Amino acid sequence: SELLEEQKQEIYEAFSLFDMNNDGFLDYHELKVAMKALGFELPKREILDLIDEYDSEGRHLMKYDDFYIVMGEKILKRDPLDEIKRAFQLFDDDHTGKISIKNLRRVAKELGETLTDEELRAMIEEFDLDGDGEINENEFIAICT
Amino acid sequence: QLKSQIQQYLVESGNYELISNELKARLLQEGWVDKVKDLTKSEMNINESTNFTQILSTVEPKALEMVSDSTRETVLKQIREFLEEIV
Amino acid sequence: AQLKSQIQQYLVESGNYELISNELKARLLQEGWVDKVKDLTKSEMNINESTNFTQILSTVEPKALEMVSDSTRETVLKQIREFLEE
Amino acid sequence: SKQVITEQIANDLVKEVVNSSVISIVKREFSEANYRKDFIDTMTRELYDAFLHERLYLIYMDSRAELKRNSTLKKKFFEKWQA
């Protein structure tokens, strides 16, 4: 168990989000979307095999403890770069290849964040060297690295 | 009533999978799955929350419509065929 | 005239037409003749379920009228004979 | 003697009882069939409704999962950037 505290939050938030009846278990459908909430998408057979493997009860469900092992593992073996790029696409939904202010504001609002229009201009300024008042990919990648 | 004796056999015969997958594959191929996923997400950008009934009511009516006539009639028949072999 | 009808008339007025009929329906039921028709009707329907009620009925009537055993026709004759001799 | 009239009347009676029976028997099988069809049409429409209901639910599940992954990513890297 060598997960950052926020990684442990990712896992717990994702399991809770599909523990529809707080029974503490997830069925196949819920398990399959829970995993997707962590970026992992698996073949129906794959997922089912995990369930039977950890199905101590015989109820065809997976308890949180087991979800945390299976998930924790795959999260450790996740590539830092692919995450930074998937993020850069999320930021730039205008599909330009450059993060613009309306983008940043759109993300700010989105995440409940509260930032003056100028906080965001300063955010941009900090790393988009050079040209033009917006961050492109290898600019963004630098930031996160 | 005895309808439950059917619902059960529908699943315990593997027929629930057959028809659900045929429905999926067809809704998917004709791009139903996509639009629906978009507009649900879209509403969800009103997120926090809102629970499934509040989304279903706002999208179900205009989703049940866009199912291809071709898809609708194929799935209805497959289901029909199922029950005929039982009654 | 032929005036068989007079004899029908008494047969009916004395309650015997009905009693004999009921007894006929009784034996037809006992001897499975009704099941043999509830079946014949299902074959014709299974053959073509596009052919309507009327057509099915026609096909069945003459056949059912023949399924009647001859010991059953007999009892009906015996009972109608006996009333006549009165 | 002249009791071929007996035969005629015995025949008419049997004729009438039979017709009576086959008619109501046929009427049964038809109404019975028509009843099955009514049942089936109703369940076909009901199960179909369920199949679409479920598909909708699994697209609801899938939309929350995608929005969750993305919001975790936007937050993680927006906050780090903001550092």
Author numbering:
A (entry chain A): 15 to 159
B (entry chain C): 7 to 93
C (entry chain D): 6 to 91
D (entry chain B): 722 to 804
Question: How do the authors describe this structure?
Answer:
Crystals were obtained of Sac3 residues 723–805 and 753–805 complexed with both Cdc31 and Sus1. The crystals obtained with Sac3723–805 had a pseudotranslation in which one half of the asymmetric unit was shifted by close to half the unit cell, which makes structure solution more difficult because this effect greatly reduces the intensity of half of the reflections and so reduces the amount of data available. The model based on the 2.5 Å resolution P21 native data was refined to an R factor of 18.8% (Rfree 23.5%) with excellent geometry and contained Cdc31 residues 9–161, Sac3 residues 753–805 and Sus1 residues 6–95. This structure was then used to solve the Sac3723–805 crystals using molecular replacement and generated a 2.7 Å resolution model that refined to an R factor of 21.0% (Rfree 26.4%) with excellent geometry. The somewhat higher values for the R factor and Rfree for this structure were a consequence of the pseudotranslation (see Chook et al., 1998). Figures 2A and 2B and Movie S1 illustrate the structure of this complex in which Sac3 was present as a long, gently undulating α helix to which were bound one Cdc31 and two Sus1 chains. The CID region comprises Sac3 residues 723–805 and forms a gently undulating, continuous 12.5 nm α helix, which is encircled by two Sus1 chains and one Cdc31 chain. The two Sus1 binding sites on Sac3CID were designated Sus1A (residues 726–751) and Sus1B (residues 760–788). Although there were extensive interfaces between Sac3 and its three partners, there was negligible interaction between Sus1A and Sus1B or between Sus1B and Cdc31. The Sus1A chain appeared to have a slightly less intimate interaction with Sac3 than the Sus1B chain.
